[PDB]
C-alpha cells in the first residue's frame, strides 16, 4: 500500500515488500 519499492522473488515467484528482504512464501533471503 504505497511503499518504497517491492521485489519479485525467484523461488516462490511472488511480490514482496521493500522491508521484507526475506519472503512471505519461501522464507528465504532476497539474496
Ligand atoms: Zn520467496
Curated annotation (Swiss-Prot):
Transmembrane segments: none
Originating species: Rattus norvegicus
Organism taxonomic ancestry: Eukaryota, Metazoa, Chordata, Craniata, Vertebrata
UniProt subcellular location: Cytoplasm, Cytosol; Endoplasmic reticulum; Nucleus
Superkingdom of this protein's organism: Eukaryota
Zinc finger (RanBP2-type): 3-31
Purpose: The ternary complex containing UFD1, VCP and NPLOC4 binds ubiquitinated proteins and is necessary for the export of misfolded proteins from the ER to the cytoplasm, where they are degraded by the proteasome. The NPLOC4-UFD1-VCP complex regulates spindle disassembly at the end of mitosis and is necessary for the formation of a closed nuclear envelope. Acts as a negative regulator of type I interferon production via the complex formed with VCP and UFD1, which binds to RIGI and recruits RNF125 to promote ubiquitination and degradation of RIGI.
Subunit structure: Heterodimer with UFD1. The heterodimer binds ubiquitinated proteins. The heterodimer binds to VCP and inhibits Golgi membrane fusion. Interacts with ZFAND2B; probably through VCP.
This protein's name: Nuclear protein localization protein 4 homolog
Family the UniProt entry places it in: Belongs to the NPL4 family.
Domain notes: Binds ubiquitinated proteins via its RanBP2-type zinc finger.
Gene: Nploc4
Amino acid at each position: 500500500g504505497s511503499t518504497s519499492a517491492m521485489w519479485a522473488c525467484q523461488h516462490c515467484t511472488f511480490m514482496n515488500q521493500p522491508g521484507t528482504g526475506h519472503c512471505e512464501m519461501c522464507s528465504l533471503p532476497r539474496t
